[PDB]
Design an enzyme around this catalytic site. Sequence first.
Site, short mmCIF file in Angstrom:
data_model
loop_
_atom_site.label_atom_id
_atom_site.label_comp_id
_atom_site.label_asym_id
_atom_site.label_seq_id
_atom_site.Cartn_x
_atom_site.Cartn_y
_atom_site.Cartn_z
N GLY A 56 6.33 -0.58 8.09
CA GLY A 56 7.66 -0.80 8.63
C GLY A 56 7.71 -0.43 10.09
N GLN A 166 3.22 24.54 7.99
CA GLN A 166 4.40 23.89 8.53
C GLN A 166 5.07 24.83 9.56
OE1 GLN A 166 7.79 23.81 8.87
NE2 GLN A 166 8.68 22.24 7.53
N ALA A 167 5.39 24.29 10.74
CA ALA A 167 5.97 25.04 11.86
C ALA A 167 7.24 25.88 11.68
CB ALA A 167 6.18 24.09 13.04
N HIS A 199 2.23 21.94 5.32
CA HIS A 199 2.85 20.74 5.83
C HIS A 199 2.02 19.51 5.42
CE1 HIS A 199 4.81 18.70 9.61
NE2 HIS A 199 5.26 18.23 8.47
N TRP A 233 10.47 17.51 -1.90
CA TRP A 233 9.89 17.08 -0.64
C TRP A 233 8.72 16.15 -0.89
CZ3 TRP A 233 12.49 17.01 3.58
CH2 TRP A 233 13.54 17.93 3.74
N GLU A 236 4.63 16.46 -0.30
CA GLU A 236 4.40 17.77 0.28
C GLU A 236 4.58 18.82 -0.81
OE1 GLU A 236 6.99 19.92 3.50
OE2 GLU A 236 5.43 18.73 4.50
N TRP A 275 5.37 17.22 16.79
CA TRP A 275 6.18 16.31 16.00
C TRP A 275 6.96 15.31 16.86
CZ3 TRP A 275 9.20 19.00 11.48
CH2 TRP A 275 8.40 19.99 10.88
N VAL A 283 13.78 3.71 11.51
CA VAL A 283 12.54 3.52 10.73
C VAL A 283 12.60 3.52 9.20
CG1 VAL A 283 11.15 4.36 12.63
CG2 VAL A 283 11.92 5.95 10.86
N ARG A 284 13.74 3.88 8.63
CA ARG A 284 13.87 3.89 7.18
C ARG A 284 14.98 2.94 6.76
NH1 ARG A 284 13.51 10.30 5.51
NH2 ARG A 284 11.34 10.68 6.13
O1 LIG Z 1 8.77 3.80 5.62
C1 LIG Z 1 7.87 4.64 5.78
C2 LIG Z 1 7.89 6.12 5.32
C3 LIG Z 1 6.76 6.81 5.63
N1 LIG Z 1 5.62 6.29 6.32
C4 LIG Z 1 4.42 7.14 6.59
O2 LIG Z 1 4.49 8.36 5.84
C5 LIG Z 1 4.33 9.52 6.71
C6 LIG Z 1 5.21 10.67 6.18
O3 LIG Z 1 6.56 10.26 6.34
P1 LIG Z 1 7.71 10.70 7.31
O4 LIG Z 1 7.18 10.63 8.69
O5 LIG Z 1 8.91 9.86 7.00
O6 LIG Z 1 7.82 12.21 6.84
P2 LIG Z 1 8.64 13.43 7.45
O7 LIG Z 1 7.54 14.20 8.36
O8 LIG Z 1 9.67 13.03 8.45
O9 LIG Z 1 9.03 14.18 6.24
C7 LIG Z 1 4.79 8.98 8.06
O10 LIG Z 1 4.19 9.71 9.13
C8 LIG Z 1 4.21 7.57 8.05
O11 LIG Z 1 2.84 7.51 8.38
C9 LIG Z 1 5.60 4.95 6.73
O12 LIG Z 1 4.64 4.46 7.33
N2 LIG Z 1 6.72 4.21 6.45
O1 LIG Z 2 11.36 21.58 3.98
C1 LIG Z 2 10.21 20.84 4.31
C2 LIG Z 2 10.55 19.83 5.14
O2 LIG Z 2 10.96 20.40 6.43
C3 LIG Z 2 11.37 19.39 7.37
O3 LIG Z 2 11.74 20.05 8.57
C4 LIG Z 2 13.01 20.78 8.59
C5 LIG Z 2 12.82 22.29 8.36
O4 LIG Z 2 12.27 22.57 7.09
C6 LIG Z 2 14.20 22.98 8.45
O5 LIG Z 2 14.04 24.36 8.24
C7 LIG Z 2 14.77 22.68 9.86
O6 LIG Z 2 16.02 23.28 9.99
O7 LIG Z 2 14.90 21.25 10.06
C8 LIG Z 2 13.65 20.51 9.96
C9 LIG Z 2 13.98 19.04 10.19
O8 LIG Z 2 13.99 18.75 11.58
C10 LIG Z 2 10.27 18.38 7.66
O9 LIG Z 2 10.70 17.37 8.58
C11 LIG Z 2 9.84 17.71 6.34
O10 LIG Z 2 8.80 16.78 6.60
C12 LIG Z 2 9.38 18.83 5.36
O11 LIG Z 2 8.25 19.54 5.89
#
Ligand SMILES: O=c1ccn([C@@H]2O[C@H](COP(=O)(O)OP(=O)(O)O)[C@@H](O)[C@H]2O)c(=O)[nH]1
Ligand SMILES: OC[C@H]1O[C@@H](O[C@H]2[C@H](O)[C@@H](O)[C@H](O)O[C@@H]2CO)[C@H](O)[C@@H](O)[C@H]1O
Length: 287
Positions: A56, A166-167, A199, A233, A236, A275, A283-284
């Site tokens: 996408g 995860q950060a 993460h 999640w 993850e 990030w 994108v979604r």
């Molecule tokens: O419609 C979509 C949803 C997810 N992704 C892939 O799945 C990974 C994890 O998804 P997303 O970035 O949405 O996760 P988030 O870090 O925001 O939870 C992305 O980096 C993309 O590589 C994609 O290609 N298309």
């Molecule tokens: O919870 C896992 C989930 O975290 C998202 O990031 C959040 C973070 O957890 C939250 O504490 C903060 O306030 O906002 C962030 C969103 O910008 C990640 O994006 C997701 O991929 C998971 O890792």
Amino acid sequence: KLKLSDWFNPFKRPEVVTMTKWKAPVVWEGTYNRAVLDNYYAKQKITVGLTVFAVGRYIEHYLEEFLTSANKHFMVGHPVIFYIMVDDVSRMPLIELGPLRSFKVFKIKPEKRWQDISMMRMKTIGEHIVAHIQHEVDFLFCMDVDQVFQDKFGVETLGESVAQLQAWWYKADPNDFTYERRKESAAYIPFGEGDFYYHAAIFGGTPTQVLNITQECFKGILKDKKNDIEAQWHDESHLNKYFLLNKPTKILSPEYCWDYHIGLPADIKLVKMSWQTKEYNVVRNNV
Ligand SMILES: O=c1ccn([C@@H]2O[C@H](COP(=O)(O)OP(=O)(O)O)[C@@H](O)[C@H]2O)c(=O)[nH]1
Ligand SMILES: OC[C@H]1O[C@@H](O[C@H]2[C@H](O)[C@@H](O)[C@H](O)O[C@@H]2CO)[C@H](O)[C@@H](O)[C@H]1O
Ligand SMILES: [Mn+2]
């Protein structure tokens, strides 16, 4: 024939967790000796592979930036193969790769819900590991496309099974972690349990280990489906359940996957990956 003490020094970063109770190192800026590792590895003629999905608008929004930076910062000085998974090869950007970089692209099926696109990766990576990656590389990393390399992301990150901290939660207590808390899901992790919050954007290890990581996570994703439940999640949550039962042999610090929206606290010395700002509206297409 390589021991941890040969390249890892936890005392360089005394104010942060540098070792787990299972003796696995947590690589932080300053604690690793890349030069010692580059030599040891150059002699083994290792090849490092990297998989990245872009389905996408994730394609137009992030694929090029990811690849351009990976080309410049990922495993420099060693043969690297980029495995690009896109639903539409016509929109795949062909950036110029540098020395020791090469790649290949596969067209994949676009799942309907973005949640499944993210979760299906587990099934697909495994299929490719058995089909070819297991024969082309020594170590493999699987990453999200919505991020970009900022600095050297090298051999100091290689290992049997590698997890990323995860950060936002690297300092939180396990009971604060956003694990899946419903016992009906295969991803379930009870309060009172857990080591760290991993993460899903970055994980890797030997092809064999990654094959086992993904196979197990996908069995978990499939099971929940039969039970009409979806991990909070998604993958993850499953990944965290997996790394709980099978501790990683190496953990990367938030410096290897940082979110600048947090700012830049004293602990993060040299960001290697950051990030991309979330753009879910563009994108979604669902939920
Ligand atoms: O419609 C979509 C949803 C997810 N992704 C892939 O799945 C990974 C994890 O998804 P997303 O970035 O949405 O996760 P988030 O870090 O925001 O939870 C992305 O980096 C993309 O590589 C994609 O290609 N298309
Ligand atoms: O919870 C896992 C989930 O975290 C998202 O990031 C959040 C973070 O957890 C939250 O504490 C903060 O306030 O906002 C962030 C969103 O910008 C990640 O994006 C997701 O991929 C998971 O890792
Ligand atoms: Mn992501």
